[PDB]
Amino acid sequence: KTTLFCASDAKAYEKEVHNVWATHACVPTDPNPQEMVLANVTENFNMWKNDMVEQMHEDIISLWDESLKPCVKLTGGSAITQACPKVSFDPIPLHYCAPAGFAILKCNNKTFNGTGPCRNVSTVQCTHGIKPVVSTQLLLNGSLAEEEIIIRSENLTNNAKTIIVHLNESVNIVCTRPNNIRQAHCNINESKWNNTLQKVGEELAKHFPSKTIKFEPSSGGDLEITTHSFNCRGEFFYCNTSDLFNGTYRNGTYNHTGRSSNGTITLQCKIKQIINMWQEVGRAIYAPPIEGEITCNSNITGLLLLRDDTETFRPGGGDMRDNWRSELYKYKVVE
Amino acid sequence: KTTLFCASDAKAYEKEVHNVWATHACVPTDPNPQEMVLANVTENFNMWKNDMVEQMHEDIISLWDESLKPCVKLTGGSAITQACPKVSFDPIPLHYCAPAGFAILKCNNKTFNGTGPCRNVSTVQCTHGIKPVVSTQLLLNGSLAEEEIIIRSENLTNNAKTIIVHLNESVNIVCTRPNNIRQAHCNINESKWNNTLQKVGEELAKHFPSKTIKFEPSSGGDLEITTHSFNCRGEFFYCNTSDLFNGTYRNGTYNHTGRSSNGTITLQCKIKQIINMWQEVGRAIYAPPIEGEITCNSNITGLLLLRDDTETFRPGGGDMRDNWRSELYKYKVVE
Amino acid sequence: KTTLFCASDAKAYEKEVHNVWATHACVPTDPNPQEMVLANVTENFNMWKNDMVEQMHEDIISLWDESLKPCVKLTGGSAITQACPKVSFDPIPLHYCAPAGFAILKCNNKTFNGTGPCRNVSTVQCTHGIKPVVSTQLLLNGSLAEEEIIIRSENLTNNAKTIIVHLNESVNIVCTRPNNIRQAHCNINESKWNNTLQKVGEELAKHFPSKTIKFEPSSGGDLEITTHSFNCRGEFFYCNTSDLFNGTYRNGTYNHTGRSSNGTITLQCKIKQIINMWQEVGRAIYAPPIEGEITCNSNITGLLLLRDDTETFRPGGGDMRDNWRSELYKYKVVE
Amino acid sequence: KTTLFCASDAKAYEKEVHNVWATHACVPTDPNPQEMVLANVTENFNMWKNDMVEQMHEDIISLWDESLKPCVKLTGGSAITQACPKVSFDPIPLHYCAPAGFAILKCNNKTFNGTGPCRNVSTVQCTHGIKPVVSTQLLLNGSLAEEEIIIRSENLTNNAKTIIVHLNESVNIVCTRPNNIRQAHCNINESKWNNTLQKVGEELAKHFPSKTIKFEPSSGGDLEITTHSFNCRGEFFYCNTSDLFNGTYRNGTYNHTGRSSNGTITLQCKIKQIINMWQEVGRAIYAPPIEGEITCNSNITGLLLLRDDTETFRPGGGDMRDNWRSELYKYKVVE
Numbered sequence A, B, C, D: 001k002t003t004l005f006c007a008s009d010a011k012a013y014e015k016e017v018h019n020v021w022a023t024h025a026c027v028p029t030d031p032n033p034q035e036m037v038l039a040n041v042t043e044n045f046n047m048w049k050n051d052m053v054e055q056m057h058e059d060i061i062s063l064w065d066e067s068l069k070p071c072v073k074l075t076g077g078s079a080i081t082q083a084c085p086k087v088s089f090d091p092i093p094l095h096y097c098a099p100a101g102f103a104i105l106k107c108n109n110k111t112f113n114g115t116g117p118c119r120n121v122s123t124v125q126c127t128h129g130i131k132p133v134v135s136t137q138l139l140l141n142g143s144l145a146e147e148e149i150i151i152r153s154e155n156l157t158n159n160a161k162t163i164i165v166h167l168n169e170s171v172n173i174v175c176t177r178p179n180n181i182r183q184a185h186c187n188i189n190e191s192k193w194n195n196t197l198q199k200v201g202e203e204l205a206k207h208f209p210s211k212t213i214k215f216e217p218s219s220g221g222d223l224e225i226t227t228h229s230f231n232c233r234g235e236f237f238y239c240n241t242s243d244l245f246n247g248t249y250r251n252g253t254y255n256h257t258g259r260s261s262n263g264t265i266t267l268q269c270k271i272k273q274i275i276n277m278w279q280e281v282g283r284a285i286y287a288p289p290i291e292g293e294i295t296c297n298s299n300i301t302g303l304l305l306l307r308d309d310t311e312t313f314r315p316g317g318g319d320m321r322d323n324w325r326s327e328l329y330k331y332k333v334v335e
């Protein structure tokens, strides 16, 4: 254990809130990246017991509390008011770094599921650039897997633990509230979603080799988890995924049961002002949306699922630590 | 430097907030105190750089935070609203104690002014019972000097430094909002205040030997310090002292120039709901006062003064550290 | 996170080194403990991330450095020598206690594994009496589980994580060197060992589907961990467990295949002077053993195991922090 | 509050013990000296409450414990023996450095007494090169004030607080045991000492504006502080200063009353093997001196004085943190 520090390519002249946070919170990044390969050493990792995740989680909570200040923050019977201006919000990469006396070991196995022994490992000073993208159900703007799709989970047997599906080919998603000021929509290409959900069904079938693999929507919870919720240019998008997690993989082949038009799935979305926070147990009230075309052009790079004759997988999330684990699985800080 | 702990006679059954906080934060007072005298040993004390004061200060800050919750708390544009019930509020004595391996040296030189060598020292484990009374200008319900009045200051030649006047006999002040509901008043017996300012002028004259001494009201600043402000029964009293600090000591003889009637000085008071906090920079808003007759009967045991041919002294205070120093002056925690 | 203090009933007249250390380092035990029970609760515990264990670890390191002074201590090629008298050495219980305002919550579910939620928790200010017994492989003189033998592990699937087996009924082990001066031996009743190993195999079989469950001696490494090593009356015993951790649990029955005679397993032991320290990475050299009959009559109360068709368990140990966790599986410092 | 790191031009091939400690304890100094000057800015410093002093203190304690091992070390009833080889001993400069996310502000006021506000401040990453020279009474081989001679004290009215006299012109002292094997002597040119003490009396008279300034020898105590004690090439010199601190500054002129011969003051020295340690309380016993001619040619750069019709000043010291303060007064560590 230690206390890592962050490095970023943030610019002090920029008024984007990730930049403004990182300029006072993190140190300039290193153009001199030294990495030492060692093929004979083998080390053990547990991405689900990684304290880098806790440190980044606290850092990102700080980022949001200093950047996305709500008009009202309701917590523990208390109500906190403050100025809630519209801001320029677009996440930037953050590197996490070990101080003197410590190193970060990085697993070089491209098929590593994030748990157990990795026997090609290198030593580095900082992780790669990580954008702190808060979202659920879908992981956006992450890093793709270099080889095959990877299924990660602390206990695939345990239906309560979140499953992280690490994709190897990105799936583009475009969400837009165009120029009702709270109604929006996302567009996704049905063909790419079809083939990536087919190969995800294959990878999931290998861990469930008399079991049909079904994809169905979230059954219940707060709207933040029953929809694809995320933040776009400052506004809180809640996008219905009934037509996205909706299909069946049986006998090696995927059939999509959700609904398209001219080859595209469109999710209906609402820009909400009352938010159930992820940083703590409480609610946050923001100002109505800004004017004009609000669009985010993101890459789906991962999935957050929960498992329930056959096995059924629904979208999940909510604990943004899982978001940070999707990217910090390779890393472990050693002395 | 060590972490001290508190000890009190707080009762588990008492709804009064000091008792409630002490049942959870302090231990019961040792009914078998031990004190060992060292009459040949001489040790150096400095009441103005005493870590015991910082410790008691933080203890009382959290006492007030857990007990006297305001309806609104405003810190530079940010407003926290909570439940603000009326509570029962009567300060109880607190003893401060060193853990194992540490002791508390107590200077028993009844002449001691707070700084320098003390030659009659002793060793205890805990201080005497100290009521944490939050006040300006007047020190209430403290413990009196044994022989003559003591004048304490970090640096008498520095007019910015607060002077603490430690009285050897107490002046009774009775303060009441009787049964506009925010109007109250305070009665002081003018002959006792006469004699007290007489001999305080004597003792200050010794330190400024012509220089006719002059007592005058506070020059300016926030209402909390320009008045005798205190808390009685939970309500915040602000009482004008322009008739109380109003005199001239000249040619060894005292001269009170404030208005009086039937031998008693009466201070006009307001119960205010908007407060400038002492714990931190900010404002605190409380509920309208409770119904009925609100009375506190206190012993003025000390004065807080500021010095501006002739020397003029005006009531001061504000930094509650000085309130604690008025009682922690004769102690020092040694390993 | 806080600084706890120890309590003991050490007596100042005792020449025994645990007493000598505790009288100077701990406070007399308080004789009316109020276990404030509660019953709508669950709080999460993690015996494998517990600051209590580290503070106890540091205090025991200090005790051993002040009490069991080696003739030589070699640390990083640096050799410091000092007086190495033979001392009276018999561990005494130490209660650990939270200071003023902080509490120790305690889980009373007597099937509680050590990590996860707990449901019948009380509150005290001090733990029970814990004797700091330093040993490997077998835990001695601990507290027994009341109901059933419990298996504790940071992660039962990571073979590299130490497994603690909290036993139920103590197995008496008697270790002696009689009146070669460094040759000793220890007797264990083989029937009770067979019984206990059957129960341990039963519960490890419910934790591991149902492969045959073999017990084998320690792989390799320093003698301190390859043997049951402990300290008795100051002398360092290294006892061979090859005829002890040696059986096969198959068919729901346990078959012991270590050598016995007349119904007793006897381990062969050497008393050593050169010791690989547990407090630090270094070596200590002690004096030749004392004259006379050196024997300890101890209760095996727990086991320290390591896992590698079938699963094999071997005696582990080495990190005395796990010895502390076995009696602080816990409790918890709370405010 | 942070943990600094050192930086030295030490050589990994020099057997000199400061070099050998600094190659395994320090990083290389960098020709990266980016000084940042900020005149608008102005900050508060207190050279007497500066954690850099304590961090350098512990570092130098570590160096001495690893470099000048005594044959015998007596502390608290315990006696520790180790090899005590004669080593090559010559202190080298050490830079102290704030890690990433921290900076070191340095006050560029050349008249700064070390306490209060400084209007010209600059930020760098590391202090200037500071030789950790352990001595009493006279500060050796340090940095010189750039304009006037500076008087430093956390309280000049408290006679117990050490006074540091920062000289602007260095006074040469040559100490030698030539080729009784423990008899040595120091030569100091009497006229430069005459001028140095006259201007020191001038500054002290400014701060004591009557008060004939009188330099007298140290009253009493351990030999370490009643003499100018220091270490030269590994040997512990104790040199008598009764002919050094022995003069009177009256009506603006200084008269040296110390015994002089041929215009040079000669201090008699003993090389001692039993030393009262400065690191902790206890004694340390070293081997007899080496053979040959043992000489240090040093620059007196400051004084350590203590104040008793007049004011008397005697040489003092013995808390090597004051030695560190004489160089670490300019600096303060910031986030």
Ligand SMILES: CNCc1ccc2c(c1)[C@@H](CC[C@H](O)CO)[C@H](CNC(=N)N)[C@H]2NC(=O)C(=O)Nc1ccc(Cl)c(F)c1
Pocket (backbone or CB within 6 Å): A134, A135, A136, A222, A224, A225, A229, A230, A231, A236, A275, A276, A277, A278, A279, A280, A281, A282, A283, A317, A318, A319, A320, A321
């Ligand atoms: C089986 N799953 C367990 C599960 C389920 C739901 C939730 C958690 C855990 C919490 C995580 C706690 C964290 O670990 C503490 O640090 C969190 C509690 N907080 C409440 N108010 N309920 C709650 N998640 C959120 O509400 C959340 O993600 N909202 C949100 C906002 C903005 C955006 Cl853009 C967004 F995409 C999402």
Ligand SMILES: CNCc1ccc2c(c1)[C@@H](CC[C@H](O)CO)[C@H](CNC(=N)N)[C@H]2NC(=O)C(=O)Nc1ccc(Cl)c(F)c1
Pocket (backbone or CB within 6 Å): B134, B135, B136, B222, B224, B225, B229, B230, B231, B236, B237, B275, B276, B277, B278, B279, B280, B281, B282, B283, B317, B318, B319, B320, B321
């Ligand atoms: C020359 N004098 C310096 C001086 C002057 C005024 C004041 C200080 C210092 C502060 C002390 C800071 C402390 O040291 C930090 O811990 C404090 C700042 N805080 C603000 N909001 N301005 C401010 N004092 C108060 O406002 C205060 O006493 N109010 C108060 C309330 C209730 C009761 Cl019953 C009462 F009797 C008093």
Ligand SMILES: CNCc1ccc2c(c1)[C@@H](CC[C@H](O)CO)[C@H](CNC(=N)N)[C@H]2NC(=O)C(=O)Nc1ccc(Cl)c(F)c1
Pocket (backbone or CB within 6 Å): C134, C135, C136, C222, C224, C225, C229, C230, C231, C236, C275, C276, C277, C278, C279, C280, C281, C282, C283, C317, C318, C319, C320, C321
């Ligand atoms: C897979 N297991 C990991 C493993 C393995 C072996 C060992 C550790 C860890 C260390 C623990 C370090 C500690 O955590 C730091 O505080 C310790 C290192 N130290 C060295 N010299 N090698 C080393 N254990 C010991 O050597 C030890 O127990 N000896 C000992 C003496 C007297 C008695 Cl009576 C006794 F019963 C035992």
Ligand SMILES: CNCc1ccc2c(c1)[C@@H](CC[C@H](O)CO)[C@H](CNC(=N)N)[C@H]2NC(=O)C(=O)Nc1ccc(Cl)c(F)c1
Pocket (backbone or CB within 6 Å): D134, D135, D136, D222, D224, D225, D229, D230, D231, D236, D237, D275, D276, D277, D278, D279, D280, D281, D282, D283, D317, D318, D319, D320, D321
């Ligand atoms: C009014 N003055 C207070 C005063 C007075 C004398 C002394 C202190 C304080 C201690 C400082 C404690 C430190 O702060 C803890 O870290 C120290 C205690 N230690 C003992 N054994 N008495 C003791 N000083 C020394 O003995 C010392 O300097 N010897 C020494 C050796 C080698 C060399 Cl070359 C040298 F030039 C000097």
Ligand SMILES: *[C@@H]1O[C@H](CO)[C@@H](O)[C@H](O)[C@H]1NC(C)=O
Pocket (backbone or CB within 6 Å): A113, A114, A115, A116, A117, A151, A152, A153, A154, A155, A156
């Ligand atoms: C991940 O791989 C390890 C082996 O390296 C295995 O023990 C574990 O069960 C795997 N987990 C999943 C979810 O595949």
Ligand SMILES: *[C@@H]1O[C@H](CO)[C@@H](O)[C@H](O)[C@H]1NC(C)=O
Pocket (backbone or CB within 6 Å): A146, A147, A148, A149, A168, A169, A199, A200, A202, A203
């Ligand atoms: C991604 O992984 C799948 C297997 O899950 C594989 O079939 C596909 O070819 C991969 N895509 C690549 C390597 O571009």
Ligand SMILES: *[C@@H]1O[C@H](CO)[C@@H](O)[C@H](O)[C@H]1NC(C)=O
Pocket (backbone or CB within 6 Å): A046, A048, A049, A115, A116, A153, A154, A155, C154, C155, C157, C158
């Ligand atoms: C550690 O890895 C195991 C598998 O090796 C995994 O099941 C578990 O979720 C991980 N985290 C733990 C046990 O805290």
Ligand SMILES: *[C@@H]1O[C@H](CO)[C@@H](O)[C@H](O)[C@H]1NC(C)=O
Pocket (backbone or CB within 6 Å): A155, A157, A158, C157, C207
């Ligand atoms: C996962 O959970 C199952 C049952 O919930 C359990 O048998 C297994 O030991 C757990 N851990 C793993 C598979 O690492």
Ligand SMILES: *[C@@H]1O[C@H](CO)[C@@H](O)[C@H](O)[C@H]1NC(C)=O
Pocket (backbone or CB within 6 Å): A226, A227, A240, A241, A242
């Ligand atoms: C998603 O849409 C379907 C149909 O439009 C609806 O039945 C479902 O309740 C919606 N879910 C959410 C979370 O709005």
Ligand SMILES: *[C@@H]1O[C@H](CO)[C@@H](O)[C@H](O)[C@H]1NC(C)=O
Pocket (backbone or CB within 6 Å): A216, A217, A242, A243, A246, A257, A258, A259
């Ligand atoms: C899949 O989508 C269709 C409409 O597109 C909907 O009727 C159906 O219920 C969905 N499947 C679910 C919710 O399991």
Ligand SMILES: *[C@@H]1O[C@H](CO)[C@@H](O)[C@H](O)[C@H]1NC(C)=O
Pocket (backbone or CB within 6 Å): A090, A091, A133, A140, A141, A230, A231, A232, A295, A296, A297, A298, A299
């Ligand atoms: C993903 O990245 C692109 C380009 O940086 C950006 O336009 C988009 O808004 C991002 N999506 C999210 C959710 O931040």
Ligand SMILES: *[C@@H]1O[C@H](CO)[C@@H](O)[C@H](O)[C@H]1NC(C)=O
Pocket (backbone or CB within 6 Å): B113, B114, B115, B116, B117, B151, B152, B153, B156, D157
């Ligand atoms: C307090 O006593 C000390 C000790 O002599 C003295 O130096 C100081 O001036 C005194 N201060 C006051 C305010 O009396």
Ligand SMILES: *[C@@H]1O[C@H](CO)[C@@H](O)[C@H](O)[C@H]1NC(C)=O
Pocket (backbone or CB within 6 Å): B147, B148, B149, B168, B169, B199, B200, B202, B203
């Ligand atoms: C209080 O002190 C004054 C001197 O300041 C003295 O004249 C007076 O008699 C004292 N009163 C007592 C001791 O009651």
Ligand SMILES: *[C@@H]1O[C@H](CO)[C@@H](O)[C@H](O)[C@H]1NC(C)=O
Pocket (backbone or CB within 6 Å): B048, B115, B116, B153, B154, B155, B156, D154, D155, D156, D157, D158
């Ligand atoms: C210094 O000591 C004097 C008397 O001992 C005291 O009045 C003063 O407050 C102390 N501190 C200073 C001058 O900063």
Ligand SMILES: *[C@@H]1O[C@H](CO)[C@@H](O)[C@H](O)[C@H]1NC(C)=O
Pocket (backbone or CB within 6 Å): B155, B157, B158, B159, D155, D156, D157
């Ligand atoms: C006290 O004040 C005087 C002038 O106001 C000043 O000379 C002195 O340095 C101050 N501090 C002390 C005496 O500690």
Ligand SMILES: *[C@@H]1O[C@H](CO)[C@@H](O)[C@H](O)[C@H]1NC(C)=O
Pocket (backbone or CB within 6 Å): B223, B226, B227, B240, B241, B242
């Ligand atoms: C106190 O009252 C007088 C007259 O009654 C007034 O001049 C003065 O301003 C008042 N001071 C405060 C602080 O209210």
